[PDB]
Write an enzyme that holds these catalytic residues in place. Structure first.
Site, PDB file in Angstrom:
ATOM      1  N   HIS A 166      -7.543   0.835  -4.351  1.00  0.00           N
ATOM      2  CA  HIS A 166      -8.542   1.026  -3.487  1.00  0.00           C
ATOM      3  C   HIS A 166      -9.948   1.742  -3.786  1.00  0.00           C
ATOM      4  O   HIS A 166     -11.067   1.222  -3.825  1.00  0.00           O
ATOM      5  CB  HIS A 166      -7.877   1.765  -2.397  1.00  0.00           C
ATOM      6  CG  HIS A 166      -7.051   1.301  -1.435  1.00  0.00           C
ATOM      7  ND1 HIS A 166      -7.019   0.415  -0.223  1.00  0.00           N
ATOM      8  CD2 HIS A 166      -5.529   0.925  -1.684  1.00  0.00           C
ATOM      9  CE1 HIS A 166      -6.012  -0.053   0.246  1.00  0.00           C
ATOM     10  NE2 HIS A 166      -5.090   0.357  -0.525  1.00  0.00           N
ATOM     11  N   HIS A 192      -2.141  -3.934  -7.246  1.00  0.00           N
ATOM     12  CA  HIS A 192      -2.125  -3.653  -5.902  1.00  0.00           C
ATOM     13  C   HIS A 192      -0.841  -4.027  -5.111  1.00  0.00           C
ATOM     14  O   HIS A 192      -0.214  -3.300  -4.246  1.00  0.00           O
ATOM     15  CB  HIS A 192      -3.349  -4.112  -5.118  1.00  0.00           C
ATOM     16  CG  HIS A 192      -3.296  -3.457  -3.775  1.00  0.00           C
ATOM     17  ND1 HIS A 192      -3.095  -4.649  -2.786  1.00  0.00           N
ATOM     18  CD2 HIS A 192      -3.300  -2.453  -3.057  1.00  0.00           C
ATOM     19  CE1 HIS A 192      -2.949  -3.978  -1.298  1.00  0.00           C
ATOM     20  NE2 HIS A 192      -3.303  -2.711  -1.616  1.00  0.00           N
ATOM     21  N   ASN A 227       2.161  -1.732  -3.303  1.00  0.00           N
ATOM     22  CA  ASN A 227       1.960  -1.850  -1.826  1.00  0.00           C
ATOM     23  C   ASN A 227       2.798  -2.518  -1.126  1.00  0.00           C
ATOM     24  O   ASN A 227       3.334  -1.797  -0.069  1.00  0.00           O
ATOM     25  CB  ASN A 227       0.311  -2.448  -1.401  1.00  0.00           C
ATOM     26  CG  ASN A 227       0.286  -2.330  -0.053  1.00  0.00           C
ATOM     27  OD1 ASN A 227      -0.065  -1.161   0.545  1.00  0.00           O
ATOM     28  ND2 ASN A 227       0.184  -3.697   0.798  1.00  0.00           N
ATOM     29  N   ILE A 243      -5.376  -4.568   2.311  1.00  0.00           N
ATOM     30  CA  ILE A 243      -4.575  -3.761   3.522  1.00  0.00           C
ATOM     31  C   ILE A 243      -4.233  -2.536   2.643  1.00  0.00           C
ATOM     32  O   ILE A 243      -3.968  -1.496   3.090  1.00  0.00           O
ATOM     33  CB  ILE A 243      -3.150  -4.555   4.083  1.00  0.00           C
ATOM     34  CG1 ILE A 243      -2.928  -3.699   4.995  1.00  0.00           C
ATOM     35  CG2 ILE A 243      -2.317  -4.877   2.887  1.00  0.00           C
ATOM     36  CD1 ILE A 243      -3.803  -3.396   6.304  1.00  0.00           C
TER      37      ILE A 243
END
Ligand SMILES: [Fe+2]
Length: 819
Positions: free
Chosen positions: A484, A670, A674, A819
């Site tokens: 992020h 990611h 995640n 997300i």
């Protein structure tokens, strides 16, 4: 002299969480010539032209879309169009998808890919412009379009001042000075992260709300955290608006939960492991008021099964579906360090004992107190184990030790700084053989494995302290910092300095989708003072600050997967192997599958780049590319701008490796960190977020409790019931694939470029991913790999399968940090 065009647009209501109004003089388009210029060298502009009729006989329309016919009057003086202006005179904005022009130019058709919200024309300082889908490096831009191209970039950069409004398309930088709320209370004050050597940090998107009254360094709160308008993704289905769930969880659901606990309507603590398993079996009974707050909310209402009155029920986490107790095994504890939610921290050990780099003049002697003779290495001596490269570690000692004193002063936090030593057995699995629990002025306790007696419970608790360290590092550093936060500066710089026309814009931007959006909601709800993280994870108000301390050591070029594996000592360079590295943990699932994905992305980038850059001098002479990279480093990651390891972007090789790393971070890295969160962490005992007490001392009630009731001792040590409910809810959201996700190997429009060679290279990339998926399937059905790929929990490692359906699937690699 008429050109037939078709507009495709979606009215606002199709994307929020009468068509004849578009006709008349409601929406005008003007064509812009790419081949004929006015006196000042700018492409000639055509007359205002209005939508003429609704086209209902168009087969290719998607959901929520409508096609309008239009007819431009465009005579021989006007040349060939390459852009258009659009003016919305309606009071309501609409989302424009495309313009198609029939029977014009030597290609027969001209396409314009737009994907943008078009607000009332009075709200914009300059008219909205869109370009055809032909790719151009700057020196190849048709001369009549050069000034349009540059002016549109000027528009996207703004002037660095002003409060941004919902319809602004202005991309700029600011520090993380928006997480504290000192005007509400000095208790909610937080340090500014970024712009200093004390607290370095990546930049985030500028919002411009203005300073608080108590602290001119901190940004005032607002109801909406701005993102540039096209980054604020709408969705055809409200259940896909997962990014808004964390906001609803913080503002609405959390207060409702707290009320049910303050009321002492439910027990405040878990008392046995069964009380936790009940959350996904029979569920928890809550007051009707609290249920009636949940069931109507979008996104939230999908997270739970309910009878609509009192019972709430969580989905069963993957980790327990096959075995309910296998998480407690030493085997699974070690396996999740290479195949779990956080597979990328374990290091090789080349000397023993491990050393600390902490300044002894402050921290005293921090050398490990583990003695070699205490370890059971299956008959190996330490010399042999080191020499064969079988000794590894998970080492949170130096990262946590500077914070342990502050954390342990909090009312309901207690932590150790931990080291875990792991031995690679001859069957290829990892065996934990010691845990060191350290406190500052250091006090160290070494805990060895034990299956019987009180010592076995102490070992179980020791593992919990390790995983509390690992959960905070996973969320705040592996996940929040490395993906992020590290990515957002590159998103900003791309829109500021690479035209929509640019080949590298088209290569990169699909991998930015929703990044800024989710991050802005996260600053508002997830990593804000008293927000979701500070309430559910150990470090509380120190959480985000700790990630700044780790960013000091972040190195962009160490984010390449082969470099990461070598830097951590879990691989060695080996040119005889397919990928140039030999893994020292042979079956290491995250790394083995990751290398296959890495290589596919590399092939795609190395094929695409040469289509537009022939030699090194072509890279050097691309002024948009050079300004892009200069600003991404010197502003976006500006606190690290003076580090020597930044690539210089002087060669084809440089450009390749920069794009490859960016795509890897945004997609597969990611995804790996995640989409396993709820599958592994939905059982709080397996991935505790917080610890609340140190080990009990002999002769106290807490020690006797440990003897007589190990389950209670465990639950008293980890995350309490109320933060568990909130945390489980958040990681369920984050682990869910929306149905409108765009996965690696796919794009949202087939016409993103007119370049057939680029489209063929992209098809090859997608076909390779399908081949890789079949290879990963075979790995998970190979009996010789089941020890690490499935483990005692019998959970196949699917987090790097490229494809997935919607939902909580434990597979699928999105293009972006979505997300
Ligand atoms: Fe994420």
């Amino acid at each position: 002299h008429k050109i037939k065009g078709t507009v495709v647009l979606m009215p606002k209501n199709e994307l929020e969480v009468n068509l004849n109004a578009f006709l008349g003089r409601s929406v005008s388009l003007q064509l812009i010539s790419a081949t004929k210029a006015d006196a000042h060298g700018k492409g000639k502009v055509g007359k205002d032209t209005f939508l003429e009729g609704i086209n209902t006989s168009l087969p290719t329309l998607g959901a929520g879309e409508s096609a309008f016919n239009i007819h431009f009057e465009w005579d021989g003086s006007m040349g060939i169009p390459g852009a258009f202006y659009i003016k919305n005179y309606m009071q309501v904005e609409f989302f424009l998808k495309s313009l198609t022009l029939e029977a014009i130019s030597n290609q027969g058709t001209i396409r314009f890919v737009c994907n943008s919200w078009v607000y009332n024309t009075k709200l914009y300082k300059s008219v909205r412009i869109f370009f055809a889908n032909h790719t151009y490096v700057p020196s190849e831009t048709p001369a009549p379009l050069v000034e349009y191209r540059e002016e549109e970039l000027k528009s996207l950069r703004g002037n660095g001042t002003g409060e941004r409004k919902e319809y602004d398309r202005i991309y700029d930088y600011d520090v993380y000075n928006d997480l504290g709320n000192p005007d509400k209370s000095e208790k909610l004050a937080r340090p500014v992260l970024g712009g200093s050597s004390t607290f370095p940090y990546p930049r985030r998107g500028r919002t411009g709300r203005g300073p608080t009254v108590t602290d001119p360094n901190t940004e005032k709160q607002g109801e909406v955290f701005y993102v540039p308008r096209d980054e604020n993704l709408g969705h055809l289905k409200s259940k896909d608006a997962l990014e808004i769930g964390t906001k609803s969880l913080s503002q609405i659901v959390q207060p409702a939960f707290e009320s049910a606990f303050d009321l002492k309507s439910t027990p405040i603590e878990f008392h046995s492991f069964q009380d936790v398993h009940d959350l996904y079996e029979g569920g928890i009974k809550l007051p009707r008021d609290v249920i009636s707050t949940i069931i109507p909310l979008p996104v939230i209402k999908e997270l739970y099964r309910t009878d609509g009155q009192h019972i709430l029920k969580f989905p069963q986490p993957h980790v327990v579906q096959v075995s309910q107790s296998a998480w407690m095994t030493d085997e699974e504890f070690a396996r999740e360090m290479i195949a779990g939610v956080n597979p990328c921290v374990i290091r090789g050990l080349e000397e023993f004992p491990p050393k600390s780099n902490l300044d002894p003049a402050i921290y005293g002697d921090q050398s490990s107190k583990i003695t070699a003779d205490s370890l059971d290495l299956d008959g190996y001596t330490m010399d042999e184990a080191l020499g064969s490269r079988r000794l590894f570690m998970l080492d949170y000692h130096d990262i946590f030790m500077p914070y342990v004193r502050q954390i342990n002063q909090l009312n309901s936090a207690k932590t150790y700084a931990t080291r875990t030593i792991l031995f690679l057995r001859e069957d290829g699995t990892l065996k934990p053989v010691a845990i060191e629990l350290s406190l500052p002025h250091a006090v160290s306790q070494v805990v060895l494995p034990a299956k019987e007696g009180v010592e076995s419970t102490i070992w179980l608790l020791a593992k919990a302290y390790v995983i509390v360290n690992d959960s905070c590092y996973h969320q705040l550093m592996s996940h929040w910092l490395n993906t992020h936060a590290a990515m957002e500066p590159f998103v900003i710089a791309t829109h500021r300095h690479l035209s929509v026309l640019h080949p590298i814009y088209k290569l990169l931007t699909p991998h930015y989708r929703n990044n800024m959006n989710i991050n802005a909601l996260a600053r508002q709800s997830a990593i804000n003072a008293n927000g979701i993280i500070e309430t559910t994870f150990l470090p509380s108000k120190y959480s985000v600050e700790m990630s700044s301390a780790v960013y000091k050591n972040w190195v962009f070029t160490d984010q390449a997967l082969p470099a990461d594996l070598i830097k951590r000592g879990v691989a060695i360079k080996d040119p005889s192997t397919p990928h140039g590295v030999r893994l020292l943990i042979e079956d290491y699932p995250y790394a083995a599958d990751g290398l296959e994905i890495w290589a596919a992305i590399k092939t795609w980038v190395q094929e695409y780049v040469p289509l537009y850059y022939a030699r090194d001098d072509d890279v050097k002479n691309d002024s948009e590319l050079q300004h892009w990279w200069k600003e991404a480093v010197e502003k976006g990651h500006g606190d690290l701008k003076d580090k020597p390891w930044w690539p210089k972007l002087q060669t084809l090789e440089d450009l390749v490796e920069v794009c490859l790393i960016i795509i890897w971070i945004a997609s597969a890295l990611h995804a790996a960190v995640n989409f396993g969160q709820y599958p592994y962490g939905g059982l709080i005992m397996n991935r505790p977020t917080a610890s609340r007490r140190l080990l009990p001392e002999k002769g106290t009630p807490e020690y006797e409790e440990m003897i007589n009731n190990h389950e209670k001792a465990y639950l008293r040590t980890i995350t309490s019931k109320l933060p568990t409910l909130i945390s489980l809810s958040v990681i369920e959201i984050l682990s869910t694939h929306a149905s409108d996700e765009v996965y690696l190997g796919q794009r949202d429009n087939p016409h993103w470029t007119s370049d057939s060679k680029a489209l063929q290279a992209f098809q090859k990339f997608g076909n390779k991913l399908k081949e890789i998926e079949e290879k990963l399937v075979r790995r998970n059905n190979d009996p010789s790999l089941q020890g690490n790929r499935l483990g005692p929990v019998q959970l196949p490692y699917t987090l790097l399968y490229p494809s997935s359906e919607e939902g909580l699937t434990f597979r699928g690699i999105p293009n972006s940090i979505s997300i």
